[PDB]
Amino acid sequence: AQNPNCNIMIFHPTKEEFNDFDKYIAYMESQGAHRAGLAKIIPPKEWKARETYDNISEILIATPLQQVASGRAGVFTQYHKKKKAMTVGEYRHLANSKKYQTPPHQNFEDLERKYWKNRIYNSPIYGADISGSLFDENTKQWNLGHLGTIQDLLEKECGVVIEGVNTPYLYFGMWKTTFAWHTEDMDLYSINYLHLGEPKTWYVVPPEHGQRLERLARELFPGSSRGCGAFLRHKVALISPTVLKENGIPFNRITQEAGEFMVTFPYGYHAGFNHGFNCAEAINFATPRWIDYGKMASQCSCGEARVTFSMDAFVRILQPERYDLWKRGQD
Ligand SMILES: O=C(O)CNC(=O)C(=O)O
Numbered sequence: 001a002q003n004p005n006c007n008i009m010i011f012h013p014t015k016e017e018f019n020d021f022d023k024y025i026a027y028m029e030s031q032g033a034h035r036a037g038l039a040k041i042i043p044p045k046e047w048k049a050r051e052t053y054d055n056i057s058e059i060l061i062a063t064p065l066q067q068v069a070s071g072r073a074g075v076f077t078q079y080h081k082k083k084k085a086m087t088v089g090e091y092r093h094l095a096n097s098k099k100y101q102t103p104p105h106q107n108f109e110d111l112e113r114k115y116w117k118n119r120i121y122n123s124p125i126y127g128a129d130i131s132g133s134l135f136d137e138n139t140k141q142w143n144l145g146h147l148g149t150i151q152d153l154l155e156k157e158c159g160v161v162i163e164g165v166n167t168p169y170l171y172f173g174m175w176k177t178t179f180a181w182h183t184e185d186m187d188l189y190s191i192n193y194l195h196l197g198e199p200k201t202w203y204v205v206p207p208e209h210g211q212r213l214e215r216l217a218r219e220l221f222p223g224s225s226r227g228c229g230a231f232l233r234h235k236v237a238l239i240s241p242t243v244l245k246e247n248g249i250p251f252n253r254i255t256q257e258a259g260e261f262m263v264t265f266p267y268g269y270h271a272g273f274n275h276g277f278n279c280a281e282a283i284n285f286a287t288p289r290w291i292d293y294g295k296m297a298s299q300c301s302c303g304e305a306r307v308t309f310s311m312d313a314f315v316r317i318l319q320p321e322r323y324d325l326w327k328r329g330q331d
């Protein structure tokens with residue numbers, strides 16, 4: 001078996017290898033990349049997402065989210081307080097202000113230490129799931145707005161035609177902005193391109209060990225667990241690498257820099273934080289190997305998760321027994 005220790009693998013495709021997206025995902029899996037839950041892909045030197053980022057300041061962040069923490073430094077939840085709209089130019093200025101800017105630090109490891117020591121005592125503001133794309137329409141390789149759709153994948157694999165669309169989302173971040181422990185809707189893949197700015201640090205649990213993380217989360221967030229059998233779907237729980245190590249949870253970490261792609265694999269739990277002002281673009285996708293994960297994916301039915309239009313069809317076709325109870329939750 002390839003990659004038996006479930007290490008995060010880093011790939012350097014040539015420009016020729018960068019033409020066929022599906023083929024390269026399959027290649028990465030042939031080398032065991034999916035066992036980690038997360039892979040990094042560094043594009044060939046001849047590639048670019050777009051010409052410049054000099055003209056993005058007028059993009060609107062309609063609902064910036066202030067991420068307010070509760071708990072202890074290594075085990076906390078965050079809730080999202082809605083703030084007034086602001087442009088990306090205004091957001092960048094805010095990110096760089098004395099209140100929100102990245103502190104002096106020696107290296108990525110020093111900054112990681114500072115993040116887990118001090119995150120809960122601040123409430124950074126995140127620009128989240130803004131529908132849109134920053135890939136140039138003429139970028140033909142690994143353009144996240146031009147991928148094959150999940151609906152077409154399901155149709156190709158299972159012969160059923162369904163409603164729904166899937167399109168990319170933009171994320172404008174600042175120091176300490178945080179993504180909570182989660183897998184994707186319907187345990188799909190995700191792909192994330194860091195367009196511009198400071199790094200993003202990722203933590204990931206191998207898919208074969210996801211239930212170990214779930215068990216620890218139930219122990220650490222007992223009220224939340226009683227309220228919902230899939231409460232990590234709420235995407236509000238954080239557990240530090242120190243606490244994961246203390247509890248013997250297998251995981252890995254890596255830092256993504258501007259110009260790099262990350263792929264998360266089905267049922268790969270991930271969490272992380274931004275180092276400073278940045279902009280990322282992400283979208284979910286599927287492959288034939290995803291279908292079995294989609295069939296088995298947990299669901300939130302307590303009503304908290306609240307999810308996209310397109311997920312209806314996924315649950316309806318892949319999980320017909322669960323569908324009625326689940327749809328009761330979306331209402
Ligand atoms: O970048 C973020 O805030 C969160 N991203 C993801 O969880 C992802 O790309 O799958």
Ligand SMILES: O=[N+]([O-])c1cccnc1O
Nearest residue numbers: 013017018023024027028
């Ligand atoms: O990108 N590939 O597909 C690939 C790269 C290297 C070796 N074999 C392959 O199939």
Ligand code: NI
Nearest residue numbers: 183184190264
């Ligand atoms: Ni994700």
Ligand SMILES: [Zn+2]
Nearest residue numbers: 228300302304
């Ligand atoms: Zn729930």
